[PDB]
């Protein structure tokens, strides 16, 4: 429940420490954790809110000009001097102008012309700093069992901040899922400014928001801002040797939108800003989880399929059943079978054990299960009343392993070491792989990692030819680097 | 550009494709994609649905270009002569008729 | 401005085609409008500024 139709969910089946299992949570999908004798839990990361951010260096992306003025002195004097040249709210430009004996001063050298114009701003955009402290994560988890397809004690919500990295989700009757997370560690926020222009917000690398050629204030503005640059938005063009003209460039808000590419969008409610794409890593202490359905008597009245048995995207099968009798809370018998002569359990039943908890007249419940690849029968019931359904699955185990490798490769391309931490109960091969991946990833990010989908595809093809024809061990070195870059790209 | 009242439409993982009636209007930009659907959202099946979104387009201002034939363009030449003119009549264009 | 041809034809912006008469028609509303989608469960339409 809550992760049936997500289409980007992965199963963390397995727990070999009898205890905590590491899991990396992403905004895209969610994680179903199934243990040996413990109920299947679906865990999802929902929203990342940021609060009380600190304004830093707002730029001015639209200028307005004002009362221009100018002066010129004859070709043999000092220099032209507007009194508004000692005002830090005016842009002043000095040049040489053809002058003499026609303009009024007898000599024929070049004059000196100064022009000053007052600067005004409209529509500035501002950036703000995100400290590692004071950003909150909200994780929603739910449990399988008795919830029909449509205080709950089967769902819980956990708030996690760097001030409280660990919390327990109290599932009434199932115990409590302890949950430790690395919130400071999970997405670097020590390089990301929160950027707003006009009711639109982004996450921006703190190196793209310092190499910007636009008039910039510093910090918050008490009153009318003082902008230091006075250029790169005001253009002093020159007439054919006799005049100066001052123009402003228009509103800049379409170039910034295209300068932003690969920057994450966000949204804002009041002093808080919700990011909808993040990455968090949690260890799941599932040792206070029980089963709410052992020591129950088998339900023996009848069962009716209420919708149909449906197939999720990953192969599993969801079934929604209605119970006719009134036996109180009682256990549901269900299995995947072939050869209905000898009912032999084939496949695996994802839900832990399906127990009906509401007994008034008719109850509804939803379970799901992982059937084998051939034809099979969903068998729900005990004797002479076991309604069954015919169900067919598509692909052999080889295709499943191939898709698993593809998913692992994509997760690696997205995360790196934290991807190495996804299913890490924790051994020595895992930690060694994570270490070597850390070293190689640091080197690769240092050398490459300044390109976007085209520079790196070009360098990939180039070095691919190079390693193909160089005839050394550098053949293997290149071809490996090329596999890296080209998959990093084609993942998309 | 400026945008206006959006709308959208979705379909079952196995139905046709979404269709807003505002796709037959040349004032709306419309885009079609695939969305995860099923059993929570409203139809029993689990594949990818089809979602269409449309929005009305309006332009506050636009730049316009115009063509120039090499005819119907005029040049204006000013010429003057030396001799008797005093220095005042160098940058003075008030009466050249007489 | 004075502008060359082939710079006033290779421009990726919504363009009418001459006599603006009644209700305006734009050949392309494409790229003046960005159709993103959320994590597989939404769609969002924004304009570039």
């Amino acid at each position, epitope marked *: 429940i809550r992760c049936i139709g997500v289409s980007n969910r992965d199963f963390v089946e397995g727990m070999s420490g009898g205890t905590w299992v590491d899991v990396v949570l992403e905004h895209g999908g969610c994680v179903t954790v199934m243990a040996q004798d413990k109920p299947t839990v679906d865990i999802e990361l929902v929203t990342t809110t940021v609060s009380n951010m600190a304004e830093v260096r707002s730029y001015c992306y639209e200028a307005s000009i004002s009362d221009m003025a100018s002066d010129s002195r004859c070709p043999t004097q000092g220099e032209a001097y507007l009194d508004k040249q000692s005002d830090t709210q005016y842009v002043c430009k000095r040049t040489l102008v053809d002058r003499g004996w026609g303009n009024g001063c007898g000599l024929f050298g070049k004059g000196s012309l100064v022009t000053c114009a007052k600067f005004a701003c409209s529509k500035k955009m501002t950036g703000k700093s995100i400290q590692p402290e004071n950003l909150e994560y909200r994780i929603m988890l739910s449990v399988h069992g008795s919830q029909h397809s449509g205080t709950d004690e089967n769902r819980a919500k956990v708030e996690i901040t760097p001030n409280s990295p660990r919390a327990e989700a109290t599932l009434g009757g199932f115990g409590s899922l302890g949950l430790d997370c690395e919130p400071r560690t999970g997405l670097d926020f020590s390089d990301l400014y929160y950027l707003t222009m006009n009711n639109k917000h982004w996450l921006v690398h703190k190196e793209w928001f310092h190499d910007i050629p636009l008039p910039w204030h510093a910090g918050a503005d008490t009153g009318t801002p003082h902008w230091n640059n006075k250029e790169a938005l005001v253009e002093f063009k020159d007439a054919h040797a006799k005049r100066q003209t001052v123009v402003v460039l228009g509103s800049q808000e379409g170039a910034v939108h295209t300068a932003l590419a690969g920057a994450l969008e966000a949204e804002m409610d009041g002093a808080k800003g919700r990011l909808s794409s993040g990455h968090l890593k949690c260890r799941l202490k599932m040792d206070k989880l029980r089963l709410k359905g052992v020591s129950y008597s088998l339900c023996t009245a009848a069962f009716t399929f209420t919708k149909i048995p449906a197939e999720t995207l990953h192969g599993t099968v969801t079934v929604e059943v209605q119970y006719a009798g009134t036996d109180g809370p009682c256990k549901v018998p269900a299995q995947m079978a072939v050869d209905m002569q000898t009912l032999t359990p084939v496949g695996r039943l994802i839900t832990a054990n399906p127990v009906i908890t509401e007994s008034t007249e008719n109850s*509804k419940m939803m379970l799901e299960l992982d059937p084998p690849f051939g034809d099979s029968y969903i068998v729900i019931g005990v004797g002479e009343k076991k309604i069954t359904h015919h169900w067919h699955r598509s692909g052999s185990t080889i295709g499943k392993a191939f898709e698993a490798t593809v998913r692992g490769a994509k997760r690696m391309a997205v995360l790196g070491d934290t991807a190495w931490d996804f299913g890490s109960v924790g051994g020595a091969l895992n930690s060694l792989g994570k270490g070597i991946h850390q070293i190689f990833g640091a080197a690769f990010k240092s050398l490459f990692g300044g390109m976007s989908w085209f520079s790196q595809i070009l360098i990939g093809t180039l070095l691919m030819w190079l390693g193909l024809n160089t005839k050394n061990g550098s053949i293997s070195l290149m071809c490996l680097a090329l596999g890296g870059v080209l998959i990093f790209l084609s993942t998309a | 550009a400026s945008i206006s009242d*959006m709308a959208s439409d979705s379909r079952c993982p196995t139905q046709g494709e979404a269709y807003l009636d505002k796709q037959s209007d040349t004032q709306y930009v419309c885009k079609r994609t695939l969305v995860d659907r099923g059993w929570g959202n409203g139809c029993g099946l689990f594949g990818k649905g089809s979602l269409v979104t449309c929005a009305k387009f309006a332009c506050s201002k636009k730049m316009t270009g115009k063509s120039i034939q090499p005819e119907n363009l005029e040049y204006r030449i000013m010429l003057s002569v030396h001799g008797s003119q005093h220095s005042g009549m160098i940058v003075n264009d008030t009466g050249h008729e007489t | 401005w004075l502008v060359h041809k082939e710079w006033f034809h290779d421009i990726p912006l919504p363009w009418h085609a001459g006599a603006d008469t009644g209700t305006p028609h734009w050949n392309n509303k494409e790229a003046l409008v960005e159709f993103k989608d959320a994590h597989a469960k939404r769609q969002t339409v924004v304009v570039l500024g």
Partner: antibody, heavy 121, light 109 residues
Framework: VQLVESGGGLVQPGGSLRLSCSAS????????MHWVRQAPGKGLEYVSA????????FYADSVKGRFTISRDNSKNTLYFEMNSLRPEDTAVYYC???????????????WGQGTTVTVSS | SEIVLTQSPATLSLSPGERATLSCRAS??????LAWYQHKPGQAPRLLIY???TRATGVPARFSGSRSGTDFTLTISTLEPEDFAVYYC??????????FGQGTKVEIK
């Protein structure tokens, strides 16, 4: 959890009216809102809807073009600006609200008391 | 075009204590997404059943719902005096063109 409707009144054909529906007791932003009307001697008719976030809106063919639904999540208010009214729009209007994580879908709803709109010549 | 719902009898005359049965027929396949509402004059319509069998919060147990293909049934076992009202079915399938049935009135016989 309640919805208080207001703004209904008698108006001439072709008149413009604005109906309001104030929500209380829940997170207004997470609820998809709908307008359902009932003419005298007729069954309930589902005419309009808007998502929780205000992104998208739906109008039934019987009202498509003349009526405009909107919402303000800060003031917790749903608005149904109905223009070009006709005598066929004389009915009791109810605003309903349902918890939605998808554009308009909802399971358990909440209804207001309704407001009468009379369009007589 | 749009999905339409048909409520068979449009009027049900029964006495307090009898068993009431109302049917709703859909024009096309809707899996279980049917809702039953009770409407009394002078009161807002009250949601009784959603998902065609699940009783809303606080609804008494005497109301039951059943489905078979496109035919949905609302059953009232023990008719009560306050149970005499109008009853509507509403289709909740996949998008808003959502519609109600013409309604069936439960009248005292």
């Amino acid at each position: 959890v309640q919805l208080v409707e207001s703004g209904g009144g008698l108006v001439q054909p072709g008149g413009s009216l604005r109906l309001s529906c104030s929500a209380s007791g829940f997170t207004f932003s997470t609820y998809s809102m709908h307008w359902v009307r009932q003419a005298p001697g007729k069954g309930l008719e589902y005419v309009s809807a808007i998502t929780g976030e205000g992104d998208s809106a739906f109008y039934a063919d019987s009202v498509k073009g003349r009526f405009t639904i909107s919402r303000d999540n800060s003031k917790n208010t749903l608005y149904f600006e109905m223009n070009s009214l006709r005598p066929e729009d004389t009915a009791v209007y109810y605003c309903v609200g349902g918890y939605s994580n998808f554009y308009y879908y909802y399971t358990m709803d909440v209804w207001g008391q309704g407001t009468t709109v009379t369009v007589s010549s | 075009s749009e999905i339409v719902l048909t409520q068979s009898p449009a009027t049900l005359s029964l006495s307090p204590g009898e068993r009431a049965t109302l049917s709703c027929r859909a024009s096309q396949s809707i899996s279980t997404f049917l809702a039953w509402y009770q409407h009394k004059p002078g009161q807002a319509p009250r949601l009784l059943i959603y998902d065609a069998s699940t009783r809303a919060t606080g609804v008494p147990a005497r109301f039951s719902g059943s489905r078979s293909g496109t035919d949905f049934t609302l059953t009232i076992s023990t008719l009560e005096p306050e149970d005499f009202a109008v009853y509507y079915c509403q289709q909740r399938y996949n998008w808003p063109p959502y519609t109600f049935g013409q309604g069936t009135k439960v009248e005292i016989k």
